[PDB]
Design a protein around this ligand. Sequence first.
Ligand SMILES: Cc1cc2nc3c(=O)[nH]c(=O)nc-3n(C[C@H](O)[C@H](O)[C@H](O)COP(=O)(O)OP(=O)(O)OC[C@H]3O[C@@H](n4cnc5c(N)ncnc54)[C@H](O)[C@@H]3O)c2cc1C
Ligand SMILES: Cc1cc2nc3c(=O)[nH]c(=O)nc-3n(C[C@H](O)[C@H](O)[C@H](O)COP(=O)(O)OP(=O)(O)OC[C@H]3O[C@@H](n4cnc5c(N)ncnc54)[C@H](O)[C@@H]3O)c2cc1C
Ligand SMILES: Cc1cc2nc3c(=O)[nH]c(=O)nc-3n(C[C@H](O)[C@H](O)[C@H](O)COP(=O)(O)OP(=O)(O)OC[C@H]3O[C@@H](n4cnc5c(N)ncnc54)[C@H](O)[C@@H]3O)c2cc1C
Ligand SMILES: Cc1cc2nc3c(=O)[nH]c(=O)nc-3n(C[C@H](O)[C@H](O)[C@H](O)COP(=O)(O)OP(=O)(O)OC[C@H]3O[C@@H](n4cnc5c(N)ncnc54)[C@H](O)[C@@H]3O)c2cc1C
Lengths: 162, 162
Amino acid sequence: STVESKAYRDAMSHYAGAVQIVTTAGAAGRRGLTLTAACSVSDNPPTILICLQKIHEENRIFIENGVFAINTLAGPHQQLADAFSGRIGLTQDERFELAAWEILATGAPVLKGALAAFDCRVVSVQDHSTHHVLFGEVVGLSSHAEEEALIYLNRRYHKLEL
Amino acid sequence: STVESKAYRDAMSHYAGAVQIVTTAGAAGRRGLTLTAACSVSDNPPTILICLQKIHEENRIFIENGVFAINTLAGPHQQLADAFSGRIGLTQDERFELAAWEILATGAPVLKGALAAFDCRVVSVQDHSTHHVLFGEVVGLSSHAEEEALIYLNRRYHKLEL
Ligand SMILES: Cc1cc2nc3c(=O)[nH]c(=O)nc-3n(C[C@H](O)[C@H](O)[C@H](O)COP(=O)(O)OP(=O)(O)OC[C@H]3O[C@@H](n4cnc5c(N)ncnc54)[C@H](O)[C@@H]3O)c2cc1C
Ligand SMILES: Cc1cc2nc3c(=O)[nH]c(=O)nc-3n(C[C@H](O)[C@H](O)[C@H](O)COP(=O)(O)OP(=O)(O)OC[C@H]3O[C@@H](n4cnc5c(N)ncnc54)[C@H](O)[C@@H]3O)c2cc1C
Ligand SMILES: Cc1cc2nc3c(=O)[nH]c(=O)nc-3n(C[C@H](O)[C@H](O)[C@H](O)COP(=O)(O)OP(=O)(O)OC[C@H]3O[C@@H](n4cnc5c(N)ncnc54)[C@H](O)[C@@H]3O)c2cc1C
Ligand SMILES: Cc1cc2nc3c(=O)[nH]c(=O)nc-3n(C[C@H](O)[C@H](O)[C@H](O)COP(=O)(O)OP(=O)(O)OC[C@H]3O[C@@H](n4cnc5c(N)ncnc54)[C@H](O)[C@@H]3O)c2cc1C
């Protein structure tokens, strides 16, 4: 037998993570959300994975379009993160209005003034209890030189110098 | 076509990660190493994944034993991390001598004075180009109240307050 759900979450509050915004576009429509469960798989050919909650049915739009982009956040941007987690109201079109964006290879929206960004095509989809897991290969890039990074730890937000 | 290997690594130097030590034991022997590519998959039942380099053949000992543990590091511990990345010499028995350890459910070594720890049984193994990916379910736990965490960013080490 496995350990209890509540006790697992209390221990994970001592494990730190860098804050992302992930996006999509195509015949099923345009969507974004705030996220921490992602990691690097290989550098030859370059490959990345992400994990999405099954209890929100609008997350099936990512699987139907077959493309996604991942954007890494800098020091001054706590207001953008609160909006894309659903804490303060608003329609999707009203959430995107808060900043400036550009296009690279696939159609998915890329953020101006990000620390880094990766534009991807889907190669595999798997089912794991409470979440779906998606694998993608990298077809476009950008990066800029800013002075601090945004981090989540012990149930609150922080800033850290490069 | 995909982007170039060297350009991918320069952009990933702007993406932060918390520092772990991962361990194993059984009929194929006892081993450890320093690591950043891991993440949380589900909370019902609790489940975690890890990624291991194919170019070092001693990493096949983890697959043969069928068990592993993951340990999260605190502020004062940069010397332990340098030893388990292979930067300063020593045999495996000589690396474990530098600190104190205990036993929970499987046999794999758990660290005294860690910020958090998770003891796991293997349920799935997959092949992805340069690395192997392993999935595990959680059968034991511990945690302690320390004041800072260890982080890797922009090709050097840092400290961050809880
Ligand atoms: C630090 C952190 C890390 C996270 N990591 C992950 C992760 O790894 N994986 C994951 O899956 N989730 C993660 N989440 C959670 C995720 O951000 C939310 O579940 C998600 O944003 C909720 O989607 P929603 O707002 O559209 O859903 P809902 O709140 O149910 O709303 C659905 C839709 O209704 C519309 N709507 C809502 N309010 C209004 C309004 N007042 N007026 C008009 N229209 C409205 C909007 O279009 C909205 O999208 C994380 C959250 C945080 C804070
Ligand atoms: C010695 C070393 C090894 C590392 N290995 C990994 C790793 O396996 N996975 C990971 O997510 N982070 C890894 N990192 C952390 C981080 O992602 C890197 O700092 C950065 O991406 C690569 O630049 P570098 O010059 O520090 O690595 P280098 O010194 O140029 O490379 C060391 C070795 O690790 C591999 N490697 C380095 N970065 C990655 C990566 N992002 N994804 C897959 N393989 C990589 C390379 O193929 C090489 O064999 C490693 C860091 C160091 C110092
Ligand atoms: C920040 C960071 C993140 C990383 N993330 C990852 C990751 O996600 N995934 C991953 O796979 N790797 C990662 N790495 C790299 C990983 O730590 C090393 O590849 C690994 O520790 C090397 O194994 P090794 O020392 O046993 O290999 P080797 O240097 O080739 O040595 C093999 C063995 O020989 C013996 N030996 C060596 N020297 C002596 C001596 N002088 N006297 C007697 N015996 C000796 C030891 O038993 C040693 O284990 C990361 C590294 C860093 C710095
Ligand atoms: C609203 C919110 C959602 C988050 N969702 C995720 C997530 O999906 N994946 C992730 O790795 N980190 C997630 N985190 C970040 C972090 O891992 C948590 O802060 C901590 O583990 C759980 O405690 P909590 O009280 O903040 O979450 P809660 O407010 O109690 O939970 C919010 C929701 O997210 C789910 N969830 C929370 N933590 C995890 C977890 N570690 N693994 C899987 N599901 C989780 C829960 O089932 C719940 O539906 C989330 C954080 C917030 C604030």
